[PDB]
Amino acid sequence: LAKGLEDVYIDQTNICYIDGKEGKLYYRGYSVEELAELSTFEEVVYLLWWGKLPSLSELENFKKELAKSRGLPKEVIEIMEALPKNTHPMGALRTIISYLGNIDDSGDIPVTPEEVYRIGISVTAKIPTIVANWYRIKNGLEYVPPKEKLSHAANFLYMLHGEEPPKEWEKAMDVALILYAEHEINASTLAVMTVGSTLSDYYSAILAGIGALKGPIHGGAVEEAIKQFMEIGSPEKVEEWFFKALQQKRKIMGAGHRVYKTYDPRARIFKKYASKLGDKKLFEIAERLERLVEEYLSKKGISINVDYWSGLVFYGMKIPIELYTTIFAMGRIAGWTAHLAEYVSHNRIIRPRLQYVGEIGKKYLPIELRR
Amino acid sequence: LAKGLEDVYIDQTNICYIDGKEGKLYYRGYSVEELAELSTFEEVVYLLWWGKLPSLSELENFKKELAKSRGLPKEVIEIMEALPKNTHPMGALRTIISYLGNIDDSGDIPVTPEEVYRIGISVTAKIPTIVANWYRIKNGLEYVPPKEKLSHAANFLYMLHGEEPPKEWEKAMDVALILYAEHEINASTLAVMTVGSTLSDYYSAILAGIGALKGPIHGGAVEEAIKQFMEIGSPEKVEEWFFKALQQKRKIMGAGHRVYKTYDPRARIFKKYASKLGDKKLFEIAERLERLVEEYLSKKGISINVDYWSGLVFYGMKIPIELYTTIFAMGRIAGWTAHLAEYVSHNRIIRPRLQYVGEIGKKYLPIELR
């Protein structure tokens, strides 16, 4: 019985490698550290989909395809304006992406590698526009069209705030997208691949990813983690909160990982940005709790994961907490697209089994003879 | 390393048992044959969710809860009227279910066994209303609200046709839903459980199921199968077509199964109804092709599956082919809901691995140096 499908390898891959015991991560052979420091989201997406770093012209041309794909048709904006104003961002994105599929000429076409990347360019480019403007529309703010000249990351901050961001913000945001871009076969990527394995359409597949990423013990933890520090209140109450949580068997959000049994390499980088951009008190609370996790839960293999420090970074960039998981989606769409294309290149329906326990051969008894 | 996860047993279950070698199927211990013969969709759903056949009182109350949840809010119908008329039913259903989730006060709540059944009653009851009326709306017909006194199966036909169906149709439709209700951990159910395993909401999980079921080699084959019979054209062209297909490495729709290595027990039952309600010629064509498969592919473990004959049955009840996969969804929502509730009762995130075959440690080269 492979519960949680733990350590079950479902296919070969050339996209990303994770070293859980050592806490190392590579995107097509390049460490996440190197990319976070020297690359950009656009270049990383290019690398993830085509397997190598782009040339000067390859990157400029790809950046151009994306830029001209950020806009949303008027009917899409109309549907956004029709959503219940209280709809949470991930759920709103889910519906909007589904509607985008309905209006796309290729919305029902069975996935193939080439077509997946084509649609991927459009959806990847569009998510930030949907997320930022959903926040605006749900709050009675004016819709802000994308700015072709800004980077993917800068343009998101631009549409959301209605003003171009400072260099340090474009950098933190871009790095955040790179760090969230890809992570092998996590739950959301598995869901995307499972839908793709039936040769369904691109949108149906990405929607499964969105649904899975939304979960509080998956991508949703980015929001639960920061709310958790806020719940603790002050650095002085951390310890008492920690032992109560352990006693209660409560999950410490932002901690633990199916693969990493040591500090998440992405968490190291996020902590660095949270240190320089995050709220001093919250960072203090987070660091205090972090030490307790390392002290008592490390032998168990529970360390800090990617969703622990990222919220503080986004919060420091004046981004509402309700949009953090959608930002994870803004980045992960790259990895989802890469995996969907890779899996269906040599497709095989994903269909496992369950071990039935119970009686078989029970005889039907008319309802009137039942007690 | 298991490409396809063939024979990988992820967890234990008490919902459904499949005997792939013997071609047997049980829902909570009861053969699908018996349930298709003596039960009803509503009763089968109750069995699937709560694990036992209901009492007179239990069934009546359940049927009451379902019937009272069939209607759609004005805002939902409005969204339906806003979708492109050329949207395929499964794609339309997907967007509508997502929206229903948006307007639901529990649309973001982490799944729990009790909550899953609660929401399950609502979505299960609304699918036929959405499906039938999507067809009507997209074609200029008036919206037809659900009729409480009708059974789930009869009500679907009533809304779609604007006319209550004859007893024989209600029966065939009811049986179809029962046969599609549950099937262990198939691709769509795995997708549903995977989303559920992150403790996401009910709607997000079901939508993953809808997206997967949609695939042409999964639930979508029910539409592909009937179109394939019509494509062949006549019992005389079958053999010809059959071999051109085998040589072209084209898959025969309605045939093959990851588990069943023999005739699908559900396909047996569907054939019977297809024989009684299906188009003569189409049936003849399907029959000749069925023989060629049992002849040439039989040895390879490739037999007839549940999606081979159902189309003909739906076609005989004047149901547009474009709605067949959504009908599969209408029934399978029961199994999706059952597994969602059962799995999260002892949750563990579903997260496997991939065998990386590339190199690591590559050094980043400045773009100008490329």
Side-chain angles (χ1 to χ4, degrees):
Chain A
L1 276 196
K3 298 186 190 193
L5 274 182
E6 171 163 24
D7 278 317
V8 172
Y9 293 63
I10 85 153
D11 195 9
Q12 281 182 329
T13 188
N14 209 35
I15 299 170
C16 156
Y17 175 72
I18 302 168
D19 184 334
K21 294 159 164 94
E22 302 304 333
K24 279 156 163 88
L25 172 69
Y26 302 85
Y27 286 175
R28 296 278 192 181
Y30 299 96
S31 71
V32 69
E33 284 89 0
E34 242 192 323
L35 293 169
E37 169 187 302
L38 317 164
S39 199
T40 60
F41 184 57
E42 286 97 333
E43 187 177 66
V44 161
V45 173
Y46 189 102
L47 168 71
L48 288 168
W49 296 359
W50 295 296
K52 57 139 227 144
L53 294 171
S55 74
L56 232 333
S57 65
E58 277 170 338
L59 181 56
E60 246 323 294
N61 170 271
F62 180 50
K63 280 211 260 158
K64 170 189 294 80
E65 283 160 344
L66 282 169
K68 61 179 193 23
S69 298
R70 310 184 176 153
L72 299 179
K74 183 229 242 280
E75 341 132 62
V76 171
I77 291 154
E78 290 187 297
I79 286 294
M80 283 177 79
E81 273 160 4
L83 299 176
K85 254 84 181 128
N86 71 152
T87 304
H88 290 204
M90 277 302 273
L93 177 62
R94 188 228 280 147
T95 302
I96 302 317
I97 299 171
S98 185
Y99 178 81
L100 263 186
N102 296 339
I103 67 187
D104 185 335
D105 278 2
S106 339
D108 287 297
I109 291 165
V111 282
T112 57
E114 339 82 44
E115 180 253 17
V116 163
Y117 292 134
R118 187 170 56 71
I119 313 281
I121 285 179
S122 169
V123 177
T124 296
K126 292 187 177 49
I127 296 185
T129 309
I130 293 163
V131 174
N133 281 300
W134 164 239
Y135 170 78
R136 302 187 63 87
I137 288 169
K138 87 196 242 89
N139 284 119
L141 300 185
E142 264 172 17
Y143 176 99
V144 175
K147 249 207 186 253
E148 211 160 359
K149 28 268 112 163
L150 301 184
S151 69
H152 193 75
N155 178 247
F156 164 66
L157 252 14
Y158 160 64
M159 292 182 299
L160 169 72
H161 291 144
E163 31 171 2
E164 303 193 357
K167 209 286 131 297
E168 329 82 60
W169 281 13
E170 190 281 343
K171 176 75 170 148
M173 188 65 213
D174 190 42
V175 163
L177 261 13
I178 289 171
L179 296 181
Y180 275 146
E182 154 69 14
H183 209 53
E184 213 222 42
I185 193 161
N186 44 93
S188 67
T189 292
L190 165 63
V192 165
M193 288 164 76
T194 302
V195 171
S197 79
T198 69
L199 261 22
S200 189
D201 68 273
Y202 180 92
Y203 296 87
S204 292
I206 271 42
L207 259 0
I210 300 285
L213 195 63
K214 189 164 170 302
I217 59 170
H218 194 189
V222 67
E223 288 174 43
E224 301 304 314
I226 186 160
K227 274 138 88 172
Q228 163 181 85
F229 305 143
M230 294 185 173
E231 171 196 326
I232 287 152
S234 67
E236 300 302 339
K237 286 177 193 190
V238 167
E239 199 193 63
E240 170 167 17
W241 181 96
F242 180 78
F243 289 102
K244 129 246 131 76
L246 287 196
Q247 196 268 323
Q248 296 167 180
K249 270 251 187 256
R250 190 230 273 235
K251 292 282 165 287
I252 282 115
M253 292 283 165
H257 200 273
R258 167 65 54 83
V259 184
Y260 294 123
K261 299 296 157 199
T262 189
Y263 221 97
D264 187 329
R266 296 162 304 167
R268 284 184 204 287
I269 301 170
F270 265 131
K271 181 185 185 186
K272 163 198 148 110
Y273 280 85
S275 182
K276 75 164 140 262
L277 294 181
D279 173 79
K280 205 243 201 317
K281 185 175 127 278
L282 256 18
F283 188 93
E284 232 151 63
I285 294 172
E287 172 59 24
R288 281 244 212 314
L289 173 55
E290 184 230 57
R291 267 164 219 203
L292 289 174
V293 166
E294 301 173 315
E295 181 181 0
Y296 300 102
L297 309 180
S298 74
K299 205 186 168 172
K300 242 191 124 143
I302 300 152
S303 189
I304 302 305
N305 67 50
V306 67
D307 293 318
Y308 194 82
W309 302 103
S310 60
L312 291 193
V313 179
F314 299 137
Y315 202 52
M317 288 193 291
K318 295 314 193 141
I319 298 170
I321 293 169
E322 65 179 330
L323 305 182
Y324 298 175
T325 309
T326 37
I327 280 159
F328 194 152
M330 283 170 37
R332 186 49 58 80
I333 178 69
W336 286 340
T337 296
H339 274 99
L340 178 58
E342 178 178 70
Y343 196 78
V344 304
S345 67
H346 297 286
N347 191 57
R348 176 142 210 250
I349 195 154
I350 302 179
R351 143 101 242 208
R353 279 278 238 143
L354 290 180
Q355 173 178 70
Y356 181 81
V357 300
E359 261 228 350
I360 85 161
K362 301 185 71 166
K363 312 285 181 197
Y364 186 90
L365 178 79
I367 198 162
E368 63 263 16
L369 292 201
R370 297 178 206 153
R371 19 293 157 308
Chain B
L1 174 70
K3 173 60 167 293
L5 285 185
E6 173 155 26
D7 280 318
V8 175
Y9 285 68
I10 299 165
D11 198 28
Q12 279 178 336
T13 187
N14 48 23
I15 296 168
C16 159
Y17 172 64
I18 307 170
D19 204 317
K21 263 214 142 139
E22 282 180 35
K24 303 189 176 167
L25 178 63
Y26 303 86
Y27 285 0
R28 298 281 195 178
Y30 296 90
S31 89
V32 69
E33 279 90 1
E34 274 214 304
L35 298 171
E37 183 83 14
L38 322 151
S39 205
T40 63
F41 184 58
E42 290 95 331
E43 193 179 59
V44 166
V45 177
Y46 186 107
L47 168 68
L48 283 172
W49 295 2
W50 290 288
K52 71 195 174 146
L53 289 177
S55 66
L56 240 357
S57 158
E58 287 173 337
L59 182 51
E60 225 27 66
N61 173 242
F62 187 54
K63 298 214 303 220
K64 198 147 232 128
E65 310 183 288
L66 281 167
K68 301 290 193 181
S69 315
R70 303 184 180 158
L72 301 182
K74 193 63 193 176
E75 356 146 29
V76 171
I77 307 179
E78 269 164 9
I79 294 297
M80 290 176 66
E81 280 162 1
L83 304 183
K85 304 287 197 248
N86 66 351
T87 307
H88 291 181
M90 280 297 275
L93 177 60
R94 185 233 275 143
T95 296
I96 298 307
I97 299 171
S98 192
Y99 182 76
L100 261 176
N102 291 340
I103 66 181
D104 191 338
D105 290 341
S106 306
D108 287 310
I109 289 169
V111 284
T112 74
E114 189 178 348
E115 188 248 11
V116 163
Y117 292 134
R118 211 226 318 144
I119 305 188
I121 285 174
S122 171
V123 178
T124 293
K126 292 171 176 58
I127 293 188
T129 307
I130 293 164
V131 176
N133 282 296
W134 166 235
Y135 174 79
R136 300 185 68 76
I137 289 174
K138 102 212 258 325
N139 289 116
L141 291 162
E142 291 180 31
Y143 173 92
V144 174
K147 201 171 286 210
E148 224 162 82
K149 69 180 145 238
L150 298 178
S151 73
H152 198 68
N155 184 245
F156 169 60
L157 290 171
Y158 158 70
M159 281 179 311
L160 177 73
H161 292 152
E163 195 69 37
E164 292 185 18
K167 190 195 158 149
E168 186 184 11
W169 282 15
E170 188 281 343
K171 179 50 173 184
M173 184 73 221
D174 197 33
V175 165
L177 292 178
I178 285 170
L179 296 180
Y180 274 138
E182 154 72 17
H183 212 56
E184 211 221 42
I185 190 152
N186 43 93
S188 65
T189 288
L190 164 64
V192 168
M193 293 167 63
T194 297
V195 172
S197 84
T198 67
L199 266 29
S200 185
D201 65 282
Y202 181 91
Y203 297 88
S204 294
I206 291 325
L207 287 156
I210 284 155
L213 193 66
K214 203 171 167 287
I217 61 164
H218 193 191
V222 63
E223 285 175 48
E224 297 306 299
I226 181 163
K227 296 199 292 229
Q228 147 191 93
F229 300 146
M230 306 188 315
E231 182 196 314
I232 292 162
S234 57
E236 293 74 25
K237 305 209 211 168
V238 180
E239 197 157 24
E240 187 190 5
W241 181 98
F242 178 85
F243 285 114
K244 134 250 112 100
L246 284 214
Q247 153 249 324
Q248 258 152 66
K249 295 200 182 176
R250 178 190 165 166
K251 291 250 188 313
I252 288 155
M253 289 291 135
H257 200 276
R258 167 64 53 85
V259 191
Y260 293 127
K261 292 317 171 183
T262 177
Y263 217 96
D264 190 323
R266 297 164 310 170
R268 284 193 205 285
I269 299 173
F270 266 127
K271 181 176 189 177
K272 299 199 169 167
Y273 281 88
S275 193
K276 178 84 196 179
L277 297 162
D279 171 84
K280 296 297 164 176
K281 186 172 191 133
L282 254 24
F283 184 100
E284 288 169 15
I285 292 163
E287 250 261 283
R288 273 245 147 63
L289 184 56
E290 184 225 55
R291 295 212 272 95
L292 283 160
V293 164
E294 291 176 325
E295 257 183 49
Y296 303 88
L297 315 176
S298 163
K299 289 219 181 162
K300 202 171 179 199
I302 300 165
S303 198
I304 298 305
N305 67 51
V306 70
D307 288 317
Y308 194 85
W309 301 104
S310 52
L312 295 187
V313 179
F314 297 137
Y315 203 41
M317 298 191 280
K318 313 309 275 177
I319 302 174
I321 298 189
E322 71 184 314
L323 309 174
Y324 298 175
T325 306
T326 39
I327 286 174
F328 193 151
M330 265 163 60
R332 191 46 66 71
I333 179 88
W336 285 341
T337 300
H339 271 102
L340 192 43
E342 164 178 81
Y343 192 81
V344 300
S345 79
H346 297 298
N347 197 57
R348 179 123 207 259
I349 196 157
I350 299 179
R351 132 109 248 195
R353 302 291 305 269
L354 286 175
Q355 178 181 108
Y356 187 70
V357 301
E359 58 174 326
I360 57 168
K362 295 186 89 170
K363 281 302 135 186
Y364 183 97
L365 185 78
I367 194 147
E368 41 278 328
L369 292 175
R370 284 167 218 164

